[PDB]
């Protein structure tokens, strides 16, 4: 019995007639490159991607961010070509590149990167960390506005918050320094949330900081809707991820319903879901910036539960499933003597009635 | 499943075969997989200090 293929087979296009007059591969890297192309294509037969691939929806994730900038490609391309000619004309750059002693300045690469393609990288990174999925239920946005956050540790040092770098609760005990480029007359809204910190509800999040109606770049002038509260990742709970969200307001907004007392050491008021927050303010508010870090437990977290929150520190533990053992049989034929220890609860001798 | 077969470069017999194939051909072979059912573990509350 035979069934006809449900579609074109892999190597059908090849002509077998002039098999001696066909370009071969001749190399392993040239076959490997074609083999990766056909591995990332849809097929009618069963594939590893079907059973393990991360399922996605056909509905393209909507964009809720700011519009892109408008740039003249022709005038841009012209300036870039000219600069390369000048750089290549210098014989000292040719000699350094031939002797393998040249190097690029890492500080200038990052300043231009943050302007051109940093937002798209930060977006790709946030999708990997699962921020859009949890915060906005799949909706995406490009962070057009670079958000520079940094925690003051001591009097001379700074711990920069980028996109997933580790930061301790000891360094994050006091509010950070937030700077971002904005025009005069604009209104913004900052926000800090713990996606994984919640102790009771999985889906919910804790609100750590909320500043509303910020004029321009001056963060202090902004109203303090929710005071700063340091992260308190429980012990044995893993690594958490806190996100700084920057919204661009179109007009002055009233956050009376989202207001929280000063201080707010109750975890039921701190509870907060970003999706609902933005959904009722999406008409007048738009996401513009993003930054996040990862946090573990340290000794300072015990000071937060005891003193600030006036509660007992919860301690978790990673527990694994109990090992599998087949059903014990009366005559375990050919099994070693230690077969009986696998079904034994206690290790101390028993004596029964005696 | 049916997946694309890429041998290891050290393996000479298989690498001497793909270098003689026409450009555009790809070799396929049948692979068996196990899709895990249970997670590595869970975080459980053990104390309130």
């Amino acid at each position: 019995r035979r069934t006809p293929p449900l579609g074109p087979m892999p190597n059908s296009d090849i002509d077998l007639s002039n098999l001696e007059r066909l370009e071969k591969y001749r190399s392993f890297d040239r076959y490997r490159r074609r083999a990766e192309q056909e591995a990332q294509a849809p097929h009618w037969w069963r594939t590893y991607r079907e059973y393990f691939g991360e399922k996605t929806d056909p509905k393209e994730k909507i964009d809720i961010g700011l519009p892109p900038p408008k740039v003249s490609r022709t005038q841009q391309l012209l300036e870039r070509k000219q600069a390369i000619q000048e750089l290549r004309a210098n014989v000292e750059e040719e000699r350094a590149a031939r002797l393998r002693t040249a190097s690029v300045p890492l500080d200038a690469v990052r300043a231009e990167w943050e302007r051109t393609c940093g937002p798209y990288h930060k977006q790709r990174l946030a999708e990997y960390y699962g921020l859009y999925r949890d915060l906005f239920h799949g909706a995406t946005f490009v962070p057009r506005v670079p958000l520079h956050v940094a925690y003051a540790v001591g009097e001379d040092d700074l711990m920069p918050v980028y996109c997933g770098n580790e930061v301790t609760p000891t360094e994050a005990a006091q509010a950070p320094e937030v700077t971002y480029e904005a025009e005069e007359g604009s209104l913004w809204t900052l926000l800090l949330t713990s996606l994984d910190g919640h102790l009771l509800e999985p889906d919910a999040e804790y609100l750590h900081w909320l500043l509303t109606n910020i004029p321009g770049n001056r963060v202090a002038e902004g109203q303090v809707t929710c005071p700063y509260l340091p992260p308190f990742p429980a012990r044995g709970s893993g690594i958490h991820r806190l996100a700084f969200l920057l919204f661009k307001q179109d007009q002055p907004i009233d956050f009376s319903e989202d207001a929280r007392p000063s201080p707010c050491y109750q975890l039921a008021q701190r509870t907060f879901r970003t999706f609902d927050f933005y959904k009722k303010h999406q008409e007048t508010m738009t996401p513009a910036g993003l930054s996040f870090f990862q946090c573990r437990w340290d000794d300072s977290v015990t000071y937060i539960f005891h003193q600030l929150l006036d509660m007992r520190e919860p301690v978790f533990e990673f527990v694994r499933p109990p090992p599998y053992h087949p059903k014990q049989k009366r005559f375990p034929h050919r099994q070693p003597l230690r077969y009986l220890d696998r079904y034994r609860d206690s290790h101390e001798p028993t004596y029964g009635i005696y | 499943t049916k997946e694309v077969y890429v041998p290891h470069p050290r393996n000479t017999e298989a690498v001497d075969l793909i270098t003689r194939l026409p450009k555009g051909a790809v070799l396929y072979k049948t692979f068996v997989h196990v899709v895990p059912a249970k997670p590595e573990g869970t975080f459980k509350l053990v104390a309130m200090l």
């Binding site: 035979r2 293929p5 087979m9 | 049916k2 075969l17 003689r20 051909a25």
Partner: peptide, 21 residues
């Protein structure tokens, strides 16, 4: 498997020159 539509997907020796001393 011979009865299945994806039978013959692993065939490779028709793409190679017959080299039989």
């Amino acid at each position: 498997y011979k009865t299945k539509p994806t039978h013959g997907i692993g065939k490779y020796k028709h793409l190679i020159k017959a080299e039989e001393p």
